[PDB]
Amino acid sequence: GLVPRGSHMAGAQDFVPHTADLAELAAAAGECRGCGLYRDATQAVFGAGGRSARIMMIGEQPGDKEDLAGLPFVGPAGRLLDRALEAADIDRDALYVTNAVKHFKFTRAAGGKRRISKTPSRTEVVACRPWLIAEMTSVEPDVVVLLGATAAKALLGNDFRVTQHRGEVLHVDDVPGDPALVATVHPSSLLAGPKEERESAFAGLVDDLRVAADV
Numbered sequence: 266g267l268v269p270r271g272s273h274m275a276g277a278q279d280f281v282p283h284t285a286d287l288a289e290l291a292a293a294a295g296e297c298r299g300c301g302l303y304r305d306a307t308q309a310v311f312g313a314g315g316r317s318a319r320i321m322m323i324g325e326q327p328g329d330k331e332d333l334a335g336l337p338f339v340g341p342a343g344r345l346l347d348r349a350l351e352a353a354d355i356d357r358d359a360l361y362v363t364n365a366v367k368h369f370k371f372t373r374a375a376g377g378k379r380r381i382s383k384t385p386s387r388t389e390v391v392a393c394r395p396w397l398i399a400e401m402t403s404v405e406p407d408v409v410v411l412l413g414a415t416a417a418k419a420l421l422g423n424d425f426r427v428t429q430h431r432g433e434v435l436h437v438d439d440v441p442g443d444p445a446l447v448a449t450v451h452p453s454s455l456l457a458g459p460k461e462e463r464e465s466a467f468a469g470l471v472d473d474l475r476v477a478a479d480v
């Protein structure tokens with residue numbers, strides 16, 4: 266064909282430039298129309314960090330605060346994650362942090378105090394995955410921490426259950442570079458609930474971060 270058929274016809278793939286440079290990738294994501302989420306979001310929120318990072322962390326999506334900060338993990342969940350990283354003795358300079366989808370999907374409720382996140386469909390996750398693959402091949406992390414169900418399923422499969430594999434180092438044969446994978450609870454889940462449950466859950470997140478950092 267004058268123009269061939271191929272992966273560039275699906276999802277975000279044709280918006281991803283043939284460069285591993287994270288600044289160029291982030292600039293290009295600002296123009297992505299790979300699914301419908303770019304329309305109502307303020308901006309794309311690419312990952313943050315550098316290519317020497319040994320640990321990559323992936324959440325679900327930018328939330329209300331991130332959508333306007335332009336940066337991942339800035340809101341209350343990000344502050345809880347910072348507390349856990351510090352308890353786990355993990356250097357922020359060793360991290361590249363991002364999300365399975367790069368545009369905030371949301372609604373409002375009258376009387377609300379924030380835009381309410383809505384779950385990306387598996388269709389949206391698969392559409393945005395080209396960016397995640399670009400990030401992973403750019404950074405070459407030794408280990409990927411998957412924060413919550415959307416991010417864990419993005420790499421481990423749509424049937425994967427975070428709740429059934431806590432503490433475990435995983436490897437799957439179609440992830441570029443074959444990094445270790447550790448799936449854990451998303452920090453937003455630890456913000457609410459009875460104290461004893463939040464405290465036990467926090468300790469478990471610190472444990473999983475420490476497993477990842479010991480890879």
Ligand code: SF4
Pocket residue numbers: 276277294297298299300301302303309366367368389392393394396
């Ligand atoms: S969520 Fe991902 S695939 Fe969809 S428009 Fe945004 S960057 Fe592109």
